[PDB]
Scaffold this active site. Structure first.
Site, PDB file in Angstrom:
ATOM      1  N   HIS A  68      34.044  38.620  -8.630  1.00 22.75           N
ATOM      2  CA  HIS A  68      35.568  38.542  -8.625  1.00 22.75           C
ATOM      3  C   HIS A  68      36.097  38.616  -7.265  1.00 22.75           C
ATOM      4  CE1 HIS A  68      35.400  38.630 -13.225  1.00 22.75           C
ATOM      5  NE2 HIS A  68      36.293  37.848 -13.127  1.00 22.75           N
ATOM      6  N   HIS A  72      34.809  33.213  -5.299  1.00 26.54           N
ATOM      7  CA  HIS A  72      35.350  32.794  -6.592  1.00 26.54           C
ATOM      8  C   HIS A  72      36.561  32.044  -6.530  1.00 26.54           C
ATOM      9  CE1 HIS A  72      36.305  32.745 -11.025  1.00 26.54           C
ATOM     10  NE2 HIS A  72      37.313  33.600 -10.611  1.00 26.54           N
ATOM     11  N   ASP A 107      42.969  35.683  -8.962  1.00 26.92           N
ATOM     12  CA  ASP A 107      42.009  36.965  -9.348  1.00 26.92           C
ATOM     13  C   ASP A 107      42.540  38.007  -8.002  1.00 26.92           C
ATOM     14  OD1 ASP A 107      40.739  36.911 -11.976  1.00 26.92           O
ATOM     15  OD2 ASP A 107      39.005  35.694 -11.114  1.00 26.92           O
ATOM     16  N   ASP A 217      38.554  28.481 -14.012  1.00 24.22           N
ATOM     17  CA  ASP A 217      37.982  29.596 -14.034  1.00 24.22           C
ATOM     18  C   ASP A 217      36.433  29.791 -14.524  1.00 24.22           C
ATOM     19  OD1 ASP A 217      38.287  32.180 -13.264  1.00 24.22           O
ATOM     20  OD2 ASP A 217      38.959  32.747 -15.190  1.00 24.22           O
TER      21      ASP A 217
HETATM   22  C1  LIG Z   1      29.872  36.476 -24.848  1.00 28.42           C
HETATM   23  C2  LIG Z   1      28.541  36.975 -24.127  1.00 28.42           C
HETATM   24  O1  LIG Z   1      27.676  37.706 -24.634  1.00 28.42           O
HETATM   25  C3  LIG Z   1      26.560  38.085 -23.879  1.00 28.42           C
HETATM   26  C4  LIG Z   1      25.531  38.869 -23.754  1.00 28.42           C
HETATM   27  C5  LIG Z   1      24.458  39.044 -22.724  1.00 28.42           C
HETATM   28  C6  LIG Z   1      23.548  39.730 -22.824  1.00 28.42           C
HETATM   29  C7  LIG Z   1      23.222  40.543 -23.855  1.00 28.42           C
HETATM   30  C8  LIG Z   1      24.059  40.473 -24.909  1.00 28.42           C
HETATM   31  C9  LIG Z   1      25.161  39.675 -24.783  1.00 28.42           C
HETATM   32  N1  LIG Z   1      26.958  37.319 -22.872  1.00 28.42           N
HETATM   33  C10 LIG Z   1      28.029  36.468 -23.071  1.00 28.42           C
HETATM   34  C11 LIG Z   1      28.720  35.729 -22.136  1.00 28.42           C
HETATM   35  C12 LIG Z   1      28.870  36.199 -20.543  1.00 28.42           C
HETATM   36  N2  LIG Z   1      29.894  35.653 -20.024  1.00 28.42           N
HETATM   37  C13 LIG Z   1      29.754  34.865 -19.038  1.00 28.42           C
HETATM   38  O2  LIG Z   1      28.983  34.245 -18.632  1.00 28.42           O
HETATM   39  N3  LIG Z   1      31.014  34.472 -18.500  1.00 28.42           N
HETATM   40  C14 LIG Z   1      31.464  33.510 -17.433  1.00 28.42           C
HETATM   41  C15 LIG Z   1      30.871  32.352 -17.333  1.00 28.42           C
HETATM   42  C16 LIG Z   1      31.376  31.663 -16.019  1.00 28.42           C
HETATM   43  N4  LIG Z   1      32.559  32.592 -15.800  1.00 28.42           N
HETATM   44  N5  LIG Z   1      32.512  33.633 -16.642  1.00 28.42           N
HETATM   45  C17 LIG Z   1      33.561  35.024 -16.771  1.00 28.42           C
HETATM   46  C18 LIG Z   1      34.347  34.960 -17.610  1.00 28.42           C
HETATM   47  C19 LIG Z   1      35.376  35.977 -17.742  1.00 28.42           C
HETATM   48  C20 LIG Z   1      35.111  37.149 -16.899  1.00 28.42           C
HETATM   49  C21 LIG Z   1      33.865  37.124 -16.060  1.00 28.42           C
HETATM   50  C22 LIG Z   1      33.080  35.990 -16.155  1.00 28.42           C
HETATM   51 MG   LIG Z   2      40.643  36.858 -13.777  1.00 26.87          MG
HETATM   52 ZN   LIG Z   3      38.731  34.004 -11.936  1.00 30.90          ZN
END
Ligand SMILES: Cc1oc(-c2ccccc2)nc1CCNC(=O)Nc1ccnn1-c1ccccc1
Ligand SMILES: [Mg+2]
Ligand SMILES: [Zn+2]
Length: 313
Positions: A68, A72, A107, A217
């Site tokens: 962040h 980004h 952000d 995003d």
């Molecule tokens: C829902 C889940 O469960 C698990 C999980 C992993 C390991 C073990 C057990 C579960 N992983 C995910 C998805 C990870 N999120 C992800 O990649 N988000 C993403 C992609 C692009 N931007 N953002 C992003 C969005 C918001 C805040 C920060 C980054």
């Molecule tokens: Mg944000």
């Molecule tokens: Zn963002």
């Protein structure tokens, strides 16, 4: 006035593509951003002295966190650039101005922690802003920086255009709260399918700009596989730090934030692509057909994560 920004040939060409990566040279990102404003908005949109001073104040107010961060901000602003350039006549003068700035600022002063961690920590920002905690803070930081002497890049707008553009930025930044995305997309899905979607309805444009903001995003999932895979490390670096901090508060974190459950990342990525990314870029492609490359790139990266699970990489 007659001072264009020009990029080297490879960047001049690749910056127009959705999947463009802004590269590891931090000192070029401001020029890349200004290039995109001049082509997206015009050489007249902003006083170059004021814009440049705004850009460097915004950079100063991003922190040295793994994901962040300043890179980004500029990455999300470039995805918005790509959507706007491929949808020329659908967006007003003010919207093109507002949304690139919204993306750069979306952000500001992020600490690498979720709204949930601020609430569980009992952070002061959680008492000031009960929902969309960091997002209300990011908009607050945008207004603060806009009010520094020589930083008001909108000063040539009329009183009413100024209020309109700040309202565009506020809604755009609040919409980057992924908790609000689920309902926004479901409503947009219903409106598109029942045929009631009307881009002259301001509350409809609002929703469509919100979905664009989610799409920009999340744009890490729309890059070529090596960019997507290496960004996933930055993303999980923050998630596992937050997990560590949850354990310090005496709370077992969700598996996504538990660095002991690294093994489970491939399956978690699948769920995220299926539950969030694919639905997001599908609805965006239905409303804005020329954003299809984002959906196609996202699908390609889902396939890449499926291959990781099958032990083919
Ligand atoms: C829902 C889940 O469960 C698990 C999980 C992993 C390991 C073990 C057990 C579960 N992983 C995910 C998805 C990870 N999120 C992800 O990649 N988000 C993403 C992609 C692009 N931007 N953002 C992003 C969005 C918001 C805040 C920060 C980054
Ligand atoms: Mg944000
Ligand atoms: Zn963002």
């Amino acid at each position: 006035g007659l001072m264009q920004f020009t990029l080297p040939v490879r960047l001049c060409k690749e910056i127009e593509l959705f999947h463009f990566d802004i590269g590891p040279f931090e000192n070029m990102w401001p020029g890349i951003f200004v290039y995109m404003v001049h082509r997206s908005c015009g050489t007249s949109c902003f006083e170059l002295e004021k814009l440049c001073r705004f850009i460097m104040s915004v950079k100063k107010n991003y922190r040295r966190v793994p994901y962040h961060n300043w890179k980004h901000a500029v990455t999300v602003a470039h995805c918005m650039y790509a959507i706007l350039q491929n949808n020329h006549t659908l967006f007003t003068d003010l919207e093109r101005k507002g949304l690139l700035i919204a993306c750069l600022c979306h952000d500001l002063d992020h600490r690498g922690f979720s709204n949930s961690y601020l609430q569980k920590f009992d952070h002061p920002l959680a008492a000031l802003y009960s929902t969309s905690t960091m997002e209300q803070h990011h908009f607050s930081q945008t207004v603060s920086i806009l009010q520094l002497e020589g930083h008001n890049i909108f000063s040539t707008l009329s009183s009413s255009e100024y209020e309109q553009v700040l309202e565009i930025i506020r809604k755009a930044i609040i919409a980057t709260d992924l908790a609000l995305y689920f309902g926004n997309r479901k409503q947009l899905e219903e409106m598109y399918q029942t045929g009631s979607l009307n881009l002259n309805n301001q509350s409809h444009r609002d929703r469509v700009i919100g979905l664009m903001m989610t799409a920009c995003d999340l744009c890490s999932v729309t890059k070529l596989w090596p960019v997507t895979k290496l960004t996933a490390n930055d993303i999980y670096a923050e998630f596992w730090a937050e997990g560590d901090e949850m354990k310090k508060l005496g709370i077992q974190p969700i598996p996504m934030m538990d660095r002991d459950k690294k093994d489970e990342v491939p399956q978690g990525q699948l769920g995220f692509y299926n539950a969030v990314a694919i639905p997001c870029y599908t609805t965006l492609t239905q409303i804005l057909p020329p954003t299809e490359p984002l959906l196609k790139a996202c699908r390609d990266n889902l396939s890449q994560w499926e291959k990781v699970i099958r032990g083919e990489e």
